[PDB]
């Protein structure tokens, strides 16, 4: 129902799980290059992923190109540096949710241009460790989907 | 805040991500044997997991042993066969959330003894494919945590 954006994702397997998440939820996926793997890589293609789950994906050469072609109504950034939790904001149609690489956050230069209200974080207890990108994305997507009533969902 | 249960988890890497999820959320993890790997396996130990994140984990020889030692107030089962969504039930202290293996569901014999109101499912759109166990667990945990106010959470 919304658009999800991977800022320079690095690991093939995470992106494959996110591609599956997006196809299972109706969320549209975007990837901001450089990616840490070729689009043709085998750890992704043979991840057991079905090719129908692809080509709803958009690749962008830069973050500025992405902004230019998508002109997101509101862009959110999942960052350990955000204050409101991911479930503490009210998502809406037109929202784009952006995620950083699995080994570093979304650049400060980008984050510095977003209002504090759109820099969100997944809660964690004291002295936690980084959560896997795909788990982060799954959590955020399902929470935004929950808020929007799971439109498109259907049973077994 | 609640207890999470893996019914015969099979793959080491998923369980390692779930162990991290549980330590990051304060959720207590239980594993119902047989596991698909030895507790000492290397794909788990060197997954980059820190050993503090362990030994809050409980292993149970059978599902009946688990019921005997834990006597869950309410036991939920995440199954593609459930009707209410995971966010459609109201979680409470004392709840135990159970998950099946990554290649099959929780046995029908077990599911047959649970009320329909406690067999829950993560929504999916038409013709979706199985979501990765760790993504399933992350999604459920964070939704139950959200409902309970993220107690224990703290900032950077």
Swiss-Prot record, chains A, B:
| EC number per UniProt | 2.1.1.207
Record localization: Cytoplasm
Q: Does the keyword S-adenosyl-L-methionine apply?
A: yes
Query: Which InterPro entries does this UniProt record tie to the protein?
Result: Alpha/beta_knot_MTases, SpoU_MeTrfase, TrmL, tRNA_m1G_MTases_N
Q: Which SUPFAM superfamilies match?
A: alpha/beta knot (SSF75217)
Question: What this chain does, per the record?
Answer: Methylates the ribose at the nucleotide 34 wobble position in the two leucyl isoacceptors tRNA(Leu)(CmAA) and tRNA(Leu)(cmnm5UmAA). Catalyzes the methyl transfer from S-adenosyl-L-methionine to the 2'-OH of the wobble nucleotide.
Known HAMAP family for this protein?
A: tRNA_methyltr_TrmL (MF_01885)
Protein name per UniProt:
tRNA (cytidine(34)-2'-O)-methyltransferase
């Amino acid at each position: 129902m919304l658009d999800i954006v991977l800022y320079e994702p690095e690991i093939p397997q995470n992106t494959g799980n996110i591609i599956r998440l997006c196809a299972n939820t109706g969320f549209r996926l975007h990837l901001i290059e450089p990616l840490g793997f070729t689009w043709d890589d085998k750890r992704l293609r043979r991840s057991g992923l079905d090719y129908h789950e692809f080509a709803e994906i958009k690749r962008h050469k830069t973050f500025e190109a992405f902004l230019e072609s998508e002109k997101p109504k509101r862009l959110f950034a999942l960052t350990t540096k955000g204050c409101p939790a991911h479930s503490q904001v009210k998502f809406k149609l037109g929202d784009y949710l952006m995620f950083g690489p699995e080994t570093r956050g979304i650049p400060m230069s980008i984050l510095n241009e977003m209002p504090m209200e759109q820099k969100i974080r997944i809660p964690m207890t004291a002295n936690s460790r980084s959560m896997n990108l795909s788990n982060s994305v799954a959590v955020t997507v399902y929470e935004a989907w929950r808020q929007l009533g799971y439109k498109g969902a259907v049973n077994l």
